[PDB]
Ligand binder design. Structure first.
Ligand SMILES: [Cl-]
Ligand SMILES: [Cl-]
Ligand SMILES: [Cl-]
Ligand SMILES: [Zn+2]
Ligand SMILES: [Zn+2]
Ligand SMILES: [Zn+2]
Ligand SMILES: [Zn+2]
Lengths: 333, 333, 333, 333
C-alpha cells in the first residue's frame, strides 16, 4: 500500500519532490488521516530549507493539516472512520508540569515536538497522528486547515498580550497567515487594531474585513505610535519597527518560523518604559478547541488565496513570497 | 443667583417638586456645570424614595449627568468655561490604598461617596463637582449622560468577570440601562452573549442589535446552561436564576442600586463548582476615560428612550418603572 | 428536490407557515439562486396580510433578497454557479417605451410586476429570477439585501426630487428601510437634510450617522418650514403633517407599500406655491447598478436591526411594527 | 478724504504702486465698503499685466473682496452700515433676458462687466459697489473673500456639468483657487473625485481634505480614464492632456482668466462619443447666495496659503506662480 507524498532527502527547496511512500499504519492511541488540505506556511518552507533538522529522513513536511479519519488504531475512542478532523500539531505527554498547567506546546517529555518536523507530516495522502491531537470539526476542511498554525499561533500571541478594550494594537506581518488571524483576535478582544503592510494600497479591503481599524505602512505606523501592544509573528524581520513604536507598559509579542533571529535589544529603553518582550510559540491544546469552535460559529474567518495539488508543492511554497498573494495557500493531496 | 431644581425635603416620589434653589458656587478644585442632560436611574429613584440616605436635605438628586462648564473654581486649570463634560460620579481622594491602585470607587477617605447622594446632584440647572471628576467630551451630551452609571457600571462588571473569547456570558436585566451596556461590553471582550429577558418576544431584536448572540427567556436560559459568566446588575431580583445557570468555574458578577438585598447562598454548590460571586460597584476613574473614548469612537451605543423637562421629573421616574419601550430616560434642565 | 419555505394559502400573518416546497427550476433566461438574506419590508407584510393580491397561490413572499447563483437556465451566459448576486425586483421587457427610456419599473408589458408578488419570492432556500435581474456584487450579501427595496426606492425618490446643494430636504419616516437610505441619498446629492422623527432622542445618533444635519420632530419641522423637498416613503401616513412644510417650488416625493393612500390635497395651495407632488416607485434598472456600486465603495451604509432564521419569519414581520425597532430586519433561510 | 490703494497707470506688476487715492463716495443704490480682505487670483494678475483692458485708468484692480459696509448711498435697504459683506463681482441690470433667467453674469446691458476691471476694485482701503451685489455674511471675512471668484466659479462649473452620484470627475488645476473648490463641489454633488496635480506628492493631503478620492498626475489620469466629467478652470493649459480622458457622454467644463485659449478640437471624437464642451464664467447671482450659506454652514472650506498687507501686493501677486503655494493668497488692506 503506497501513497503520493512530497519528500526531501536533503534540505533545500530544490530537493522537495513528489515521491511514492509507504502508507503509514496507526498504532495504539493513533489515527490514520486521509489528508484533504494542508497549509503552506513559513515554518514548512524553513523546514524544507533546513533551518532545523527534521526526522525521519527522507522527510515528508507539512505541520498544518485537516482530513478525514481513515482508520482508528487500537483502543481509540471518540473518533471513528469517516470523521472530519483537524490536527493539533504539538506532541504532548499530558503528565508533565507544562502539560498539567495547560502549556502543552512546552511539553518537557516530547520537547515540544512538532508534527511534520519530528514526524512525517501532511504533504501526503495519509498521515498518522495521536488520536488526542485530532479534533472533530463540522467546519469546511479547507478553512479548518488554516487553524493549527495560523489561527492557533495568533490566538496564543493575543492571549499572551493581555489586550484590554481600547488599547492600540499594531499587527506586523498582518497579511501573513498568522498575522491575518492576529488582526481578528486583537479585534475580538476589544483592541483598536492597526494592521501594518507595505502593500497597504492593495490589501486594505482584506485587512479591514479581518477587523483592522486602519491599515498603515511601516513608516505610517511610526507616526501613529505609541502602541500598547505589538503582535509580530515574523521573527526578527521587523524588530526595529516593532520595538520602537511601543509606549509605556507596551507588550511586544514575538513569534517566528525557526529561522535565526538575533536582534539588538536596548534594555534601558525596555526598563525605562516597562516594556515586556513576550515569546509565543504554537498554542495550548485547550485553546485549539476554542479556535475550532470560533471558526464553526463564524466568529473568525479563513482568508484563502489559492489551492495547489501535491505535485505543485514547490510552486506553492514559492507563492508565499509573491507580492500578489493575499491569503492562505493550501495543498490538496 | 437662583436656579430651578427638583428637590425633596422628605422622601417619597410624591414630595419631589420643582423649586427655586440657590445656585451653588465652585470653590478650590471644583467646577460649576450648567447641566444639559441627567440620567434617570434606579439609584436616583431609590434615593428619592428614601431607600438610601441623602445629604444635604432638602436634597437635589441626580447622580448621572453631563453639561457645560459655566465657572471654574479658584485655581482650577485644565478645564475651561464652555467645555462640554460628563461627570464621574464617585468622590475620591487620590491618596489612599484604593485610589492609588486605581479603585477610586472604593476610596477609603470619602467612603465611596456618590455625587447626587452625599452632594446635591444634577436634577437642576447647575451643579458643582470636583474638577478632576469632569471629563471633557466631544460626544453628544445626551449620549454622554448614559455613561457615568449605565456604561461605567457595566464596564466594571465585565472587567471583573475575566471574560475570555468563546466563553458563554449571560446578561440578566439586559433591557436595563446597565444591562444593555453589559451586553455590549461582554461582546466587545469576545464573549458569546446571551441576553435574558422575560420580555424576549418584544425585546429580542433590540438586544441583538446591542450585540447579543441570542436572547432567551429565563426558562430557556436554564435549558442552555451552563454559562461561564453571569452579569447581573439587578441586585437580588434574579439571584436564583443567575446563580443556578453557572457552570464549573463560573463567575457571577453582581451589582445593584442600593436597596435591600439578602440572598440564600449555597456554599456547597459554590465550592463544588469553584464558582466566584464577584461584587461590582461604579467603575474606576481610569476606566471612565476609556468608556468616554469608546463612545466618542462609536464602539459602544447609547440606547435612549425619551427626554423630559425638569418639571416632568415625576413622569420621568414613573417611565423608569413602567417603560413604553427599552432605553434611557433623561431629564433636560 | 424539496426546500424549506414560508408560504401562505390564504392571507393573514397567522396563515404564513413553514412548509416543504418543490425547489424551482430555472427556465430560459432565468437563474436559480440560493437565498442568503431576504429583507423584511412593509411591502412583504402587506402581501402576507392580503392588502396586495399575490400569485401564484399558495404563495412564497419576499421581494428583496440576495444570494448565490445555484443554476443557470438554458441560454444564460454572463452568470454562473457560485456568483454572489443581489436581485432587481421588477420584471421588465426591455423593448417598450418605458424600458427603452430607462424606466424599467414602469414596463408596459409586465405591468411593473414585482418579484415575490407575481412570482414566488425569497422567503425560501431557493428562488428563480430573470438572469438580467441578478446583479453580481462583491458586497456582503447581508448589506446587499438592503438594496432592492430600501436603497433603490430611496435613490429613485431623491433622483426625482431634483435636489440641489443647499436645498432644505425633509425626510419623513426617516428610520424606515427606505427613509434611512433617503437621508443618505439626499445628503449625497448635496441637500441640507432634516430627518423627521417623533422618536428624536432614540434615533438621533443613527440618523446623524446616515447623513442628517438635524433631527426634528414633526412639530419642530413645522416651525422650521419652509422646506424645498419632502421625501415621504410612508404612503399617506405623514401627508397631513408634512405637506404644509413645503415652500415655493417645493417637491413632495411620495412612495409607499401598496396600501390605501387617499389624502386631501389643497389644490389652491399647490398651484399658488408651484408645489409638485411626485410619485416614485421602485427604481430604474440602471440606477440599481449604481446603488450596488455605491454600497461596494462604502459610500452608503446598511443599518441593520436583527437577522432572524426563516422559522421565525412571523416574528420578523411583527418586528416591523414594533416600537423598539430601528433599522433593517432580515431573514436568513 | 484719502485712502491707500494699489494702482497702475500702465500695465505690469512693476507698475502697480501704492498711491494715495480719493476715497470714493456711494451714489444711489451703492454702498461704500471698508475692504478687509481681497483675493489674489489669475484674473487680477492678468488685469495688472494688461492682458485684459481695465477702466478707469489709472486703475485699482481687485475683483474678489469682502469687508464692512462703511456708508450706504440713497435708496439702500437690507444692507446697513456695520454689516460684514462679501461682494458678487458681476454688474447686472436685472431687466434683460439673461438677468431675468438667472444668468446675471451674462447681462446684455452691462456686458458682463466685472467689478475691479470696469470699476475700481478692492486692492484699496475702500471700494464702492452696487448694494445689490453685497451679501451679508456671518462667516469670517478672510474665508468669505475666497468666494466671489474661487468658490462661485467652481460652483457654476460643477452646476453646468450635471454631475450625478457615482460619476467619475477629474479636476484639472485642482490646487488653484477655483480648482480646490471644484474638488469640494464635485464631491458635494456625489462625484468620485480625482484631483490632477503635477505636485501630487506635496498636495495630496490637502486635496484629500478638500474631498478628492485620489490625487493623480496628468499621466496617471490618462491611465484612469475614462471620466464622465472634467472640470478645467485653467483655460487652454491642460486641454491636450485632458480632453482625451473623457468617455461616452463626457462633459468638459472650461473656465479661464481671459488669456488666449485657442485649442485643436477633434469634432469627430466629440460627436462620436456625444461629448459636450461647456463654457463657464463667473456664476449666477442666486448661486452666490447659496455658496455663502454653504461656507457659513461649514460645508465648504477656504484653504489659505498666506495673507499679505496692501504694501506687499506685488509679492502677493507673484506668489500665484510660486511652486510652494498651496492655497489662497489674500491681501488685507
Ligand atoms: Cl505567511
Ligand atoms: Cl420600514
Ligand atoms: Cl489660482
Ligand atoms: Zn508534557
Ligand atoms: Zn481615596
Ligand atoms: Zn418594458
Ligand atoms: Zn441684465
Amino acid at each position: 500500500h503506497e501513497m503520493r507524498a512530497a519528500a526531501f532527502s536533503t534540505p533545500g527547496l530544490e530537493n522537495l519532490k513528489l515521491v511514492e511512500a509507504e502508507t503509514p499504519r496507526p498504532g495504539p492511541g493513533e489515527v490514520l488521516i486521509r489528508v484533504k488540505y494542508a497549509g503552506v506556511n513559513p515554518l514548512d518552507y524553513n523546514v524544507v530549507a533546513g533551518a532545523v533538522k527534521a526526522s525521519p529522513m527522507p522527510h515528508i513536511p507539512g505541520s498544518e493539516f485537516a482530513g478525514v479519519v481513515e482508520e482508528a488504531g487500537p483502543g481509540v475512542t471518540g473518533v471513528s472512520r469517516g470523521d472530519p478532523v483537524v490536527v493539533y500539531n504539538r506532541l504532548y505527554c499530558g503528565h508533565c508540569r507544562q502539560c498539567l498547567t495547560g502549556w502543552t506546546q512546552m511539553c518537557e517529555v516530547t520537547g515540544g515536538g512538532i508534527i511534520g518536523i519530528v514526524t512525517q507530516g501532511g504533504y501526503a495522502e495519509y498521515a498518522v497522528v495521536p488520536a488526542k491531537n485530532a479534533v472533530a470539526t463540522r467546519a469546511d476542511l479547507k478553512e479548518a486547515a488554516t487553524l493549527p498554525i495560523g489561527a492557533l499561533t495568533a490566538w496564543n500571541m493575543a492571549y499572551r498580550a493581555s489586550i484590554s478594550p481600547g488599547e492600540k494594537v499594531a499587527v506586523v506581518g498582518a497579511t501573513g497567515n498568522v498575522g491575518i488571524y492576529a488582526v481578528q483576535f486583537a479585534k475580538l478582544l476589544g483592541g483598536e487594531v492597526y494592521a501594518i503592510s507595505r502593500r497597504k494600497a492593495k490589501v486594505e479591503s482584506i485587512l479591514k474585513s479581518a477587523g483592522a481599524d486602519a491599515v498603515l505602512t511601516p513608516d505610517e505606523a511610526k507616526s501613529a505610535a505609541p502602541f500598547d501592544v505589538v503582535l509580530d509573528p515574523t521573527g526578527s524581520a521587523s524588530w526595529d519597527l516593532s520595538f520602537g513604536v511601543l509606549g509605556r507598559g507596551g507588550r511586544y509579542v514575538t513569534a517566528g518560523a525557526l529561522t535565526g533571529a538575533e536582534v539588538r535589544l536596548d534594555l534601558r529603553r525596555l526598563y525605562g518604559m516597562q516594556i515586556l518582550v513576550i515569546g509565543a510559540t504554537g498554542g495550548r491544546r485547550a485553546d485549539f478547541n476554542t479556535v475550532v469552535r470560533l471558526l464553526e460559529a463564524g466568529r473568525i474567518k479563513a482568508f484563502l488565496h489559492n489551492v495547489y495539488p501535491l505535485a505543485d508543492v514547490r510552486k506553492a511554497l514559492e507563492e508565499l513570497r509573491s507580492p500578489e498573494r493575499v491569503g492562505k495557500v493550501l495543498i490538496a493531496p
